Design an enzyme around this catalytic site. Structure first.
Site, PDB file in Angstrom:
ATOM      1  N   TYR B  19       0.853  -1.185   0.000  1.00  0.00           N
ATOM      2  CA  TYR B  19       0.000   0.000   0.000  1.00  0.00           C
ATOM      3  C   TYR B  19       0.894   1.242   0.000  1.00  0.00           C
ATOM      4  O   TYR B  19       1.767   1.426   0.875  1.00  0.00           O
ATOM      5  CB  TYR B  19      -0.890   0.008   1.251  1.00  0.00           C
ATOM      6  CG  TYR B  19      -1.737   1.251   1.372  1.00  0.00           C
ATOM      7  CD1 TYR B  19      -2.871   1.417   0.587  1.00  0.00           C
ATOM      8  CD2 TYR B  19      -1.397   2.262   2.254  1.00  0.00           C
ATOM      9  CE1 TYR B  19      -3.652   2.559   0.684  1.00  0.00           C
ATOM     10  CE2 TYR B  19      -2.165   3.415   2.354  1.00  0.00           C
ATOM     11  CZ  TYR B  19      -3.297   3.551   1.566  1.00  0.00           C
ATOM     12  OH  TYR B  19      -4.078   4.686   1.653  1.00  0.00           O
ATOM     13  N   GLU B 106       6.379 -17.895  -9.486  1.00  0.00           N
ATOM     14  CA  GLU B 106       6.317 -16.444  -9.742  1.00  0.00           C
ATOM     15  C   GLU B 106       5.395 -16.138 -10.927  1.00  0.00           C
ATOM     16  O   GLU B 106       4.526 -15.252 -10.862  1.00  0.00           O
ATOM     17  CB  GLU B 106       7.724 -15.890  -9.964  1.00  0.00           C
ATOM     18  CG  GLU B 106       7.770 -14.405 -10.300  1.00  0.00           C
ATOM     19  CD  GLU B 106       9.215 -13.929 -10.408  1.00  0.00           C
ATOM     20  OE1 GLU B 106       9.844 -13.740  -9.350  1.00  0.00           O
ATOM     21  OE2 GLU B 106       9.732 -13.768 -11.552  1.00  0.00           O
ATOM     22  N   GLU B 117      -1.709  -5.829  -4.113  1.00  0.00           N
ATOM     23  CA  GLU B 117      -1.702  -5.458  -2.705  1.00  0.00           C
ATOM     24  C   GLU B 117      -1.933  -6.652  -1.794  1.00  0.00           C
ATOM     25  O   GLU B 117      -1.606  -6.597  -0.608  1.00  0.00           O
ATOM     26  CB  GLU B 117      -2.715  -4.343  -2.389  1.00  0.00           C
ATOM     27  CG  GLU B 117      -4.168  -4.816  -2.242  1.00  0.00           C
ATOM     28  CD  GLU B 117      -4.761  -5.191  -3.560  1.00  0.00           C
ATOM     29  OE1 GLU B 117      -4.669  -4.381  -4.517  1.00  0.00           O
ATOM     30  OE2 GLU B 117      -5.270  -6.318  -3.688  1.00  0.00           O
ATOM     31  N   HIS B 159     -13.869  -9.362  -5.031  1.00  0.00           N
ATOM     32  CA  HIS B 159     -12.844  -9.035  -6.042  1.00  0.00           C
ATOM     33  C   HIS B 159     -12.241 -10.282  -6.682  1.00  0.00           C
ATOM     34  O   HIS B 159     -11.444 -10.153  -7.593  1.00  0.00           O
ATOM     35  CB  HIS B 159     -11.737  -8.135  -5.467  1.00  0.00           C
ATOM     36  CG  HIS B 159     -12.278  -6.862  -4.924  1.00  0.00           C
ATOM     37  ND1 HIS B 159     -12.983  -5.962  -5.698  1.00  0.00           N
ATOM     38  CD2 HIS B 159     -12.330  -6.401  -3.651  1.00  0.00           C
ATOM     39  CE1 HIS B 159     -13.418  -4.984  -4.923  1.00  0.00           C
ATOM     40  NE2 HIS B 159     -13.035  -5.223  -3.686  1.00  0.00           N
ATOM     41  N   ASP B 195     -21.027  -2.774  -1.308  1.00  0.00           N
ATOM     42  CA  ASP B 195     -19.698  -2.355  -0.880  1.00  0.00           C
ATOM     43  C   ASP B 195     -19.288  -1.133  -1.740  1.00  0.00           C
ATOM     44  O   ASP B 195     -19.726  -1.015  -2.890  1.00  0.00           O
ATOM     45  CB  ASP B 195     -18.769  -3.564  -1.103  1.00  0.00           C
ATOM     46  CG  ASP B 195     -17.336  -3.328  -0.634  1.00  0.00           C
ATOM     47  OD1 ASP B 195     -16.591  -2.603  -1.315  1.00  0.00           O
ATOM     48  OD2 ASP B 195     -16.931  -3.907   0.390  1.00  0.00           O
ATOM     49  N   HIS B 197     -16.635  -0.560  -3.272  1.00  0.00           N
ATOM     50  CA  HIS B 197     -15.867  -0.958  -4.445  1.00  0.00           C
ATOM     51  C   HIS B 197     -16.652  -1.859  -5.365  1.00  0.00           C
ATOM     52  O   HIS B 197     -17.453  -2.681  -4.908  1.00  0.00           O
ATOM     53  CB  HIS B 197     -14.585  -1.659  -3.991  1.00  0.00           C
ATOM     54  CG  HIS B 197     -13.745  -0.806  -3.099  1.00  0.00           C
ATOM     55  ND1 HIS B 197     -13.830  -0.847  -1.720  1.00  0.00           N
ATOM     56  CD2 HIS B 197     -12.785   0.099  -3.396  1.00  0.00           C
ATOM     57  CE1 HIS B 197     -12.989   0.041  -1.209  1.00  0.00           C
ATOM     58  NE2 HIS B 197     -12.346   0.631  -2.203  1.00  0.00           N
ATOM     59  N   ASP B 284     -17.804   0.063   3.714  1.00  0.00           N
ATOM     60  CA  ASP B 284     -16.804   1.068   3.364  1.00  0.00           C
ATOM     61  C   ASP B 284     -17.382   2.270   2.601  1.00  0.00           C
ATOM     62  O   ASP B 284     -16.648   3.169   2.229  1.00  0.00           O
ATOM     63  CB  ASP B 284     -15.578   0.466   2.667  1.00  0.00           C
ATOM     64  CG  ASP B 284     -15.920  -0.507   1.591  1.00  0.00           C
ATOM     65  OD1 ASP B 284     -17.096  -0.709   1.244  1.00  0.00           O
ATOM     66  OD2 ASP B 284     -14.922  -1.084   1.094  1.00  0.00           O
ATOM     67  N   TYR B 323     -13.668  -0.912   6.657  1.00  0.00           N
ATOM     68  CA  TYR B 323     -12.318  -0.884   7.235  1.00  0.00           C
ATOM     69  C   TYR B 323     -12.156   0.169   8.337  1.00  0.00           C
ATOM     70  O   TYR B 323     -12.995   1.061   8.492  1.00  0.00           O
ATOM     71  CB  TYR B 323     -11.272  -0.696   6.106  1.00  0.00           C
ATOM     72  CG  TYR B 323     -11.463  -1.800   5.103  1.00  0.00           C
ATOM     73  CD1 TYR B 323     -10.991  -3.073   5.377  1.00  0.00           C
ATOM     74  CD2 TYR B 323     -12.207  -1.604   3.942  1.00  0.00           C
ATOM     75  CE1 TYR B 323     -11.215  -4.121   4.501  1.00  0.00           C
ATOM     76  CE2 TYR B 323     -12.416  -2.662   3.043  1.00  0.00           C
ATOM     77  CZ  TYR B 323     -11.933  -3.905   3.346  1.00  0.00           C
ATOM     78  OH  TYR B 323     -12.153  -4.964   2.499  1.00  0.00           O
TER      79      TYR B 323
HETATM   80  N1  LIG Z   1      12.764 -13.684  -9.298  1.00  0.00           N
HETATM   81  C1  LIG Z   1      13.073 -13.119 -10.600  1.00  0.00           C
HETATM   82  C2  LIG Z   1      12.746 -11.637 -10.529  1.00  0.00           C
HETATM   83  C3  LIG Z   1      12.914 -10.975 -11.896  1.00  0.00           C
HETATM   84  N2  LIG Z   1      12.473  -9.593 -11.855  1.00  0.00           N
HETATM   85  C4  LIG Z   1      12.853  -8.632 -12.882  1.00  0.00           C
HETATM   86  C5  LIG Z   1      14.193  -8.894 -13.578  1.00  0.00           C
HETATM   87  C6  LIG Z   1      14.364  -7.848 -14.686  1.00  0.00           C
HETATM   88  C7  LIG Z   1      15.729  -7.860 -15.379  1.00  0.00           C
HETATM   89  C8  LIG Z   1      15.672  -7.030 -16.668  1.00  0.00           C
HETATM   90  S1  LIG Z   1      17.163  -7.133 -17.692  1.00  0.00           S
HETATM   91  N1  LIG Z   2      -5.833   3.613  -2.387  1.00  0.00           N
HETATM   92  C1  LIG Z   2      -6.854   2.575  -2.446  1.00  0.00           C
HETATM   93  C2  LIG Z   2      -6.257   1.200  -2.154  1.00  0.00           C
HETATM   94  C3  LIG Z   2      -7.269   0.127  -2.565  1.00  0.00           C
HETATM   95  N2  LIG Z   2      -6.776  -1.230  -2.381  1.00  0.00           N
HETATM   96  C4  LIG Z   2      -7.730  -2.334  -2.317  1.00  0.00           C
HETATM   97  C5  LIG Z   2      -8.977  -2.105  -1.443  1.00  0.00           C
HETATM   98  C6  LIG Z   2      -9.813  -3.396  -1.368  1.00  0.00           C
HETATM   99  C7  LIG Z   2     -11.135  -3.335  -0.586  1.00  0.00           C
HETATM  100  C8  LIG Z   2     -12.008  -4.549  -0.922  1.00  0.00           C
HETATM  101  S1  LIG Z   2     -13.663  -4.522  -0.175  1.00  0.00           S
HETATM  102  K   LIG Z   3     -20.242  -2.462  -4.972  1.00  0.00           K
HETATM  103 ZN   LIG Z   4     -14.833  -2.569  -0.509  1.00  0.00          ZN
END
Ligand SMILES: NCCCNCCCCCS
Ligand SMILES: NCCCNCCCCCS
Ligand SMILES: [K+]
Ligand SMILES: [Zn+2]
Ligand SMILES: [K+]
Ligand code: NA
Ligand code: NA
Ligand SMILES: [Zn+2]
Lengths: 341, 341
Positions: B19, B106, B117, B159, B195, B197, B284, B323
């Protein structure tokens, strides 16, 4: 050969990178350029010149204008919104989303991003423009008749697509150089990306263009960053049909295998009729690279440079990745030794 | 009315949320459920029961199997890869990417995520299954003839899309409840998301389905999370045409305006012929909420519950967001007072 390098790279000196669920000091740090510059000079490449500044004429032909506008003010807007850390995207326009562009900074940073490890920090835009300038001036040397030049770009470029930043990249320097060569009179140019990672940004920019051929050798995207482009089946679309050649390779790949893909890529480039090759050079293919799984040795970089230069067409070498150890410098310098030898 | 609630919500107790470019303790923390439970009991809703456990029968009809398999093992795989923090996505399948699914952790965590987030932590899957179970048992009460019930779900659900987690959500509890009602014999069901959102996950799940109507009142996605869905123009496609109704509203919206959208949404739901309404309840929308820009007052929640219940159709209330402030409990309890009054 001339080395083009701007001290303004240091304006990008971000404090954080999202890696392994932690915010850590970035891998793509100013000391990389210091290590590389020192090593290329030690190898005898001491004709080092700053680039002239450039405006947006060339870059507007490869990046979206809204994207560039966004980068220009992203940091200021992020700070003005009251966020305490550096500017890191969270929401992304993934499967089955609206194509609409948000108006706010949180929405926009995600709209314009492909990877959240990369934080925007104060000075990022200015550093990116300086790095672009190094690539433009390198291209101009090739256009003027030099057979080799090295643009010591930082930040790197090859993960930045038409309208996305990520992978430590903001302006696709290699794409700008290729465009500059076309603008100076070339009809066909190739970009050869030898960095360990797929140049997904470069591929995006030229995927539907028949004037540029893009070849990339890289870790298989089934298991390597950037994860969502770089498969062999991706050969181009529309006007660009037949002008993307991806060579995904697996864990532990050594030069004896990697060099076979290099030979094939150069065959493809020759058949396309490239008038020059922009080499997107990352040395994260090295057996000691902290984030990569290829096994090239320092002497292999000499072989690589020699083989690419035996194309007999002019080369612009554009710096991309290579991390962790000061030997990134030796490895870059060895590519240049191979080109110049 | 019966309140369904699992103490196993507490197995989701993540350490971090991304955040403002920092890793901070999450907004969606176990105290939320404690506060809400205490307030509903204080308001006289003290018939609280734990859900029976449920397997994946119902949920496999709204979420992709690969996605659920991914969630079941994500933490284990992340830890085995040697990453030190919690499991947070970095690369995402954004514009013009390959549709292929990565094999590595990954790549997969990004493939299956819509918003970075939200970290996956040990216990997340188990907690999500318990929250799903509360939604299923609530639906079963409605199916058996009760006109109201409250599923105190945590983690929340709206979400989470067909094959994506994000916004603090992993299993779309409201979507599972709607499916359970269909499976118990309903032909037409509505989900009404109040909600602040947009319920982008819920919209995704039912966008091409004509058996479920989805209405959402929310902050305009041009400026508010989730940023990439929730525009009024999105009305459904295929078999789902005309079964999504989005009511985006702007900064400062009070009940006098928000309630007009509520009235319209209920007209649409009645015209659709919903046999029951699953209410995705986030509080919220409150004038004090730390991450939102609507201006509802605590008394407005009683009005809201009464109006929704005046539909004359059974309601399952399913907990979503809300929240920060102690009033989250009072605000939820007030919706239940409006329903029960
Ligand atoms: N765990 C692997 C993370 C890779 N994250 C970005 C690498 C970007 C290199 C650009 S040349
Ligand atoms: N600056 C806004 C951050 C929003 N990030 C996700 C909020 C999720 C609420 C779900 S009810
Ligand atoms: K909604
Ligand atoms: Zn929400
Ligand atoms: K590459
Ligand atoms: Na092309
Ligand atoms: Na529908
Ligand atoms: Zn790289």
């Amino acid at each position: 050969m001339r080395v083009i390098f701007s001290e303004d790279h240091k304006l990008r000196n971000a404090k954080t990178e999202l890696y392994g669920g932690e915010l850590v000091p970035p891998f793509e740090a100013p000391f990389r350029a210091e290590w590389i510059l020192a090593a290329v000079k030690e190898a005898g490449f001491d004709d080092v010149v700053a680039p002239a500044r450039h405006g947006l004429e060339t870059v507007l032909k490869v990046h979206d204008a809204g994207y560039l506008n966004f980068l220009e003010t992203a940091w200021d807007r992020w700070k003005a919104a009251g966020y305490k850390g550096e500017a890191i995207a969270t929401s992304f326009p993934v499967r089955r989303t609206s194509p609409r562009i948000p108006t706010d900074i949180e929405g926009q940073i995600g709209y314009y991003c492909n990877a959240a490890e990369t934080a925007i920090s104060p000075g990022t835009w200015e550093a990116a423009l300086s790095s672009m300038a190094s690539a433009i001036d390198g291209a101009d040397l090739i256009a003027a008749g030099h057979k080799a030049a090295f643009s010591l770009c930082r930040p790197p470029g090859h993960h930045a697509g038409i309208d996305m930043f990520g992978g430590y990249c903001f302006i696709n320097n290699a794409a700008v150089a290729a465009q500059r060569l076309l603008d100076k009179g070339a009809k066909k140019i190739a970009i050869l990306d030898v960095d360990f990672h797929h140049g997904n940004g470069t591929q995006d920019i030229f995927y539907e263009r028949g004037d540029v051929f893009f070849a990339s050798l890289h870790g298989d995207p089934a298991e390597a960053f950037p994860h969502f482009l770089g498969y062999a089946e991706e050969t181009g679309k529309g006007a660009g049909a037949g002008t993307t050649a991806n060579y995904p390779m697996g864990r532990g790949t050594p030069y004896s295998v990697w060099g076979e893909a290099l030979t094939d890529s150069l065959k493809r480039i020759a058949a396309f009729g490239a008038e020059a090759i922009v080499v997107s050079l990352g040395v994260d293919t090295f057996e000691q690279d902290p984030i990569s799984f290829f096994k090239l040795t320092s002497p292999d970089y000499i072989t690589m440079g020699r083989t690419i230069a035996a194309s007999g067409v002019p080369l612009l070498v554009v710096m991309e990745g290579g991390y962790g150890v000061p030997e990134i410098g030796l490895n870059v310098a060895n590519v240049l030794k191979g080109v110049a030898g």
